[PDB]
Protein backbone atom coordinates (compact mmCIF):
# COMPACT_ATOMS: atom_id res chain seq x y z
CA UNK A 1 0.00 0.00 0.00
CA UNK A 2 0.91 3.68 -0.38
CA UNK A 3 3.32 2.99 -3.26
CA UNK A 4 3.38 3.10 -7.06
CA UNK A 5 3.02 -0.50 -8.27
CA UNK A 6 1.63 -2.64 -11.09
CA UNK A 7 -1.27 -4.59 -9.58
CA UNK A 8 -3.21 -7.60 -10.87
CA UNK A 9 -6.48 -8.25 -9.01
CA UNK A 10 -8.64 -11.18 -10.17
CA UNK A 11 -9.14 -10.47 -13.91
CA UNK A 12 -8.10 -6.79 -13.78
CA UNK A 13 -4.62 -5.28 -14.05
CA UNK A 14 -3.19 -1.78 -14.01
CA UNK A 15 -0.73 0.65 -12.47
CA UNK A 16 -1.36 3.12 -9.67
CA UNK A 17 -1.05 3.89 -5.97
CA UNK A 18 -3.18 1.60 -3.80
CA UNK A 19 -4.57 3.17 -0.61
CA UNK A 20 -7.28 1.65 1.57
CA UNK A 21 -10.23 4.06 1.75
CA UNK A 22 -13.60 4.21 3.50
CA UNK A 23 -15.55 3.43 0.31
CA UNK A 24 -17.85 0.41 0.63
CA UNK A 25 -18.80 -1.72 -2.37
CA UNK A 26 -21.89 -3.91 -2.33
CA UNK A 27 -21.21 -7.43 -0.99
CA UNK A 28 -20.95 -9.23 -4.35
CA UNK A 29 -19.65 -6.31 -6.46
CA UNK A 30 -15.84 -6.18 -6.59
CA UNK A 31 -14.91 -3.66 -9.30
CA UNK A 32 -15.92 -0.01 -9.43
CA UNK A 33 -15.52 2.78 -11.95
CA UNK A 34 -15.51 6.57 -11.88
CA UNK A 35 -17.33 9.16 -14.02
CA UNK A 36 -14.72 8.46 -16.73
CA UNK A 37 -15.62 4.73 -16.88
CA UNK A 38 -12.17 3.85 -15.49
CA UNK A 39 -11.75 1.79 -12.33
CA UNK A 40 -10.94 4.09 -9.40
CA UNK A 41 -10.92 1.33 -6.76
CA UNK A 42 -10.83 -2.44 -6.30
CA UNK A 43 -11.80 -4.71 -3.41
CA UNK A 44 -9.12 -7.07 -2.14
CA UNK A 45 -9.75 -10.37 -4.00
CA UNK A 46 -8.72 -12.25 -0.84
CA UNK A 47 -9.47 -10.21 2.30
CA UNK A 48 -12.33 -7.73 2.67
Amino acid sequence: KNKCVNFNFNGLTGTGVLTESNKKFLPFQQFGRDIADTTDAVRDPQTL
Binding site: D34, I35, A36, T38, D40
Partner: peptide, 28 residues
Amino acid sequence: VTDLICAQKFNGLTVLPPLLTDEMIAQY
Protein backbone atom coordinates in the same frame (compact mmCIF):
# COMPACT_ATOMS: atom_id res chain seq x y z
CA VAL B 1 -20.82 29.85 -8.67
CA THR B 2 -19.61 26.25 -8.45
CA ASP B 3 -13.90 14.82 -7.39
CA LEU B 4 -14.68 16.03 -10.91
CA ILE B 5 -11.12 17.12 -11.67
CA CYS B 6 -9.91 14.13 -9.64
CA ALA B 7 -11.00 11.67 -12.34
CA GLN B 8 -9.97 13.85 -15.29
CA LYS B 9 -6.65 14.92 -13.75
CA PHE B 10 -5.76 11.21 -13.56
CA ASN B 11 -6.53 10.60 -17.26
CA GLY B 12 -3.58 12.85 -18.19
CA LEU B 13 -5.44 16.19 -18.34
CA THR B 14 -3.79 18.55 -15.84
CA VAL B 15 -5.52 21.71 -14.64
CA LEU B 16 -2.91 24.43 -14.19
CA PRO B 17 -3.53 26.83 -11.29
CA PRO B 18 -3.96 30.48 -12.29
CA LEU B 19 -0.96 32.73 -11.83
CA LEU B 20 -3.31 35.24 -10.15
CA THR B 21 -5.05 33.75 -7.12
CA ASP B 22 -8.64 34.67 -6.29
CA GLU B 23 -7.45 36.23 -3.01
CA MET B 24 -5.32 38.85 -4.76
CA ILE B 25 -8.08 39.43 -7.33
CA ALA B 26 -10.38 40.56 -4.52
CA GLN B 27 -7.77 43.16 -3.54
CA TYR B 28 -7.92 44.57 -7.07
